[PDB]
Design an enzyme around this catalytic site. Sequence first.
Site, short mmCIF file in Angstrom:
data_model
loop_
_atom_site.label_atom_id
_atom_site.label_comp_id
_atom_site.label_asym_id
_atom_site.label_seq_id
_atom_site.Cartn_x
_atom_site.Cartn_y
_atom_site.Cartn_z
N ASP A 65 -50.12 -10.64 31.12
CA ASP A 65 -48.69 -10.57 30.84
C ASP A 65 -48.15 -12.00 31.17
O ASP A 65 -48.86 -12.79 31.83
CB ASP A 65 -48.15 -9.46 31.73
CG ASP A 65 -46.66 -9.50 31.94
OD1 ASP A 65 -45.90 -9.78 30.97
OD2 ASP A 65 -46.26 -9.12 33.06
N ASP A 81 -44.17 -13.34 31.40
CA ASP A 81 -43.06 -13.57 32.30
C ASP A 81 -43.33 -12.81 33.60
O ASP A 81 -43.82 -11.67 33.56
CB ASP A 81 -41.75 -13.10 31.68
CG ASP A 81 -40.58 -13.29 32.63
OD1 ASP A 81 -40.29 -14.49 32.93
OD2 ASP A 81 -40.06 -12.26 33.13
N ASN A 127 -41.99 -10.15 24.72
CA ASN A 127 -40.89 -11.00 24.30
C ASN A 127 -40.87 -11.04 22.78
O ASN A 127 -41.84 -11.45 22.16
CB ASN A 127 -41.02 -12.41 24.88
CG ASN A 127 -39.70 -13.16 24.90
OD1 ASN A 127 -38.91 -13.05 23.99
ND2 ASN A 127 -39.45 -13.93 25.97
N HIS A 159 -34.04 -8.07 31.80
CA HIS A 159 -34.92 -9.16 32.30
C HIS A 159 -34.16 -10.06 33.23
O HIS A 159 -33.02 -10.43 32.93
CB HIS A 159 -35.44 -10.00 31.14
CG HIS A 159 -36.10 -9.17 30.09
ND1 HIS A 159 -37.39 -8.70 30.23
CD2 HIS A 159 -35.63 -8.66 28.93
CE1 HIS A 159 -37.69 -7.96 29.18
NE2 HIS A 159 -36.65 -7.93 28.37
N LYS A 186 -46.22 -3.29 24.98
CA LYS A 186 -46.59 -2.61 26.22
C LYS A 186 -45.46 -1.64 26.66
O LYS A 186 -44.27 -2.01 26.58
CB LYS A 186 -46.78 -3.66 27.33
CG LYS A 186 -47.69 -4.83 26.93
CD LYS A 186 -47.69 -5.91 28.05
CE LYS A 186 -46.37 -6.70 28.06
NZ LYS A 186 -46.38 -7.81 29.10
N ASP A 192 -46.57 -7.97 36.00
CA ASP A 192 -45.58 -7.84 37.08
C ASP A 192 -44.71 -6.58 36.98
O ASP A 192 -43.84 -6.37 37.84
CB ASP A 192 -44.64 -9.06 37.08
CG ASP A 192 -43.63 -9.03 35.91
OD1 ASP A 192 -44.06 -8.64 34.81
OD2 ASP A 192 -42.45 -9.39 36.09
C1 LIG Z 1 -36.07 -10.60 25.40
C2 LIG Z 1 -37.25 -10.65 26.33
N1 LIG Z 1 -38.29 -9.75 26.14
C3 LIG Z 1 -39.39 -9.80 27.01
C4 LIG Z 1 -39.42 -10.74 28.06
C5 LIG Z 1 -40.67 -11.12 28.84
O1 LIG Z 1 -41.73 -10.29 28.44
P1 LIG Z 1 -43.12 -10.30 29.22
O2 LIG Z 1 -42.82 -10.05 30.68
O3 LIG Z 1 -43.82 -9.10 28.62
O4 LIG Z 1 -43.84 -11.62 28.98
C6 LIG Z 1 -38.37 -11.63 28.22
C7 LIG Z 1 -38.45 -12.67 29.31
O5 LIG Z 1 -37.94 -13.77 29.10
C8 LIG Z 1 -37.28 -11.59 27.36
O6 LIG Z 1 -36.36 -12.60 27.42
CA LIG Z 2 -43.83 -9.48 32.61
#
Ligand SMILES: Cc1ncc(COP(=O)(O)O)c(C=O)c1O
Ligand SMILES: [Ca+2]
Lengths: 292, 292
Positions: A25, A27, A60, A180, A211, A236
């Site tokens: 993953d 973020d 994302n 987020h 996911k 996370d």
């Molecule tokens: C719109 C959006 N979707 C998803 C996430 C992050 O997703 P992931 O934790 O699955 O990488 C973010 C984090 O910046 C976000 O801005």
């Molecule tokens: Ca994440």
Amino acid sequence: MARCERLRGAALRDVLGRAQGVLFDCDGVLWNGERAVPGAPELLERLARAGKAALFVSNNSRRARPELALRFARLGFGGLRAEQLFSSALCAARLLRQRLPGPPDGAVFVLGGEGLRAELRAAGLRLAGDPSAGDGAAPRVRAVLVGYDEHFSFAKLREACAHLRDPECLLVATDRDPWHPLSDGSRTPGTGSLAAAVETASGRQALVVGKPSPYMFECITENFSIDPARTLMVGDRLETDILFGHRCGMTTVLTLTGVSRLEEAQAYLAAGQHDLVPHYYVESIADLTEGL
Amino acid sequence: MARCERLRGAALRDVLGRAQGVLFDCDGVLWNGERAVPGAPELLERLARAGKAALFVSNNSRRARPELALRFARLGFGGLRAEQLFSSALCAARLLRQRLPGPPDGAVFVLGGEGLRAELRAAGLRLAGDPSAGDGAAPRVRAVLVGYDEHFSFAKLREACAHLRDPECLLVATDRDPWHPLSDGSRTPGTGSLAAAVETASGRQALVVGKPSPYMFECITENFSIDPARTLMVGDRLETDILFGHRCGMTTVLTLTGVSRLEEAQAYLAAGQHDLVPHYYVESIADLTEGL
Ligand SMILES: Cc1ncc(COP(=O)(O)O)c(C=O)c1O
Ligand SMILES: [Ca+2]
Ligand SMILES: Cc1ncc(COP(=O)(O)O)c(C=O)c1O
Ligand SMILES: [Ca+2]
Ligand SMILES: [Ca+2]
Ligand SMILES: [Ca+2]
């Protein structure tokens, strides 16, 4: 089963040694906003050297793959092939190419941004509001896609509902992340919040791409032979990444640099909710490097 | 208990004779859009003559009481006192006057239209975005109110979330109706859809003012001595009006001119879900008049 064990020492050396690959993953794991987690880039470097595959899975829906690839590089994650990067935008585009109903011999109504639209068009999908051919009727809308939409409005919600009146029109969500965290301590609403509004107003259940949907794993494994029994899933968010890992049959590792807290994992363990309990946890992924 | 019996004949004469008053839901019951249900006005006329009290309870957060009163008259329901009309807008204003925290030593952030804002200001509430005193700081927001908001946006959702970061900031919804049928067969999203987005993004549960919340009955009975054991609750939505009646201890009557279908009531009965089963049903409220 998963007992939320702090992964370290010989156990860490064993777990990482046996793994054929690691699915990350993004973020909360590799970075928080524009700040790389210290030691994250060095981990990925050492993994490549250890002959261990790395793949990246993000919910994302903001960036099409080319802009996503630039982001990895910028944060210190060099040498990556675009093929190693999977987002809910890419996999939603793929799911719709695979599932859009209608005779050969639809259009997709999109709630989402330009990066998402770019990904959909790259997969060959026609979008509602793309220009029509000559002066004929607009194509029939056969799916509504809900992604992260900073321009979400009541009028767009109303329009989504109109399309969904046709029971054969699909409803698809990129992901259900509810919100987020931003760098200043504030939060942005997540796609899950918009999907909630659309499902409620239409009385429909959305098909979720990202996911913890097993579909995301199908998307990653279309191109890649990976054995889930030999793959570590690192994330996370308990309800997203750890649940995803369990659903896919992977060993799960919670990193503590993001959304979910150790206390919450332990609470789920206590309540016997094992699909929300990671097999292992680490303070940050930098703790993994020693095991190589 | 409730067995979803077709109310007619001597039973109807008995039920109506014993009732001291009738509480009417509005849309789907008295009218559909701008069309009165035929015979509805005549029922209310005959009820007044029978010496039976009538009260009106709507989840509609669009109109302040003066505009609501005009609407009843226009649809053929004459002679009514404004005091007989209760909406989720009026009762939300009242709940906030009663519950707004903060020292004596807040402001209310409103997602909703001008009729709702008018009702809140009439109850003495200060609204976020009302003009500030001299050039001092804007007042602290101590409640977020979600109503029917045709100008709902991602930016407003984000702002609602920011206010809700303070755990002492209330979250209140006028109602949770998910959508409403329009005269051409289409639907408009309901407050329930917007409340879903706000609850999801903030991770909060909203306090609901309108039906089926017992609070709505508290609002009606602040001014009116009514015995719920002697009151009929008449409505078209199982999950809203019939549930409300059961929660309040009233005899419930489903009318079939609105959202819920007889088949659905019978399905709930079969599944033993008695709080979603009306005691009685009628094809339309015009069927009640005979009982007087
Ligand atoms: C719109 C959006 N979707 C998803 C996430 C992050 O997703 P992931 O934790 O699955 O990488 C973010 C984090 O910046 C976000 O801005
Ligand atoms: Ca994440
Ligand atoms: C926004 C809104 N809320 C509520 C309703 C109707 O509420 P009720 O059926 O409780 O009278 C309507 C019907 O027009 C509506 O437009
Ligand atoms: Ca922690
Ligand atoms: Ca109604
Ligand atoms: Ca029916």
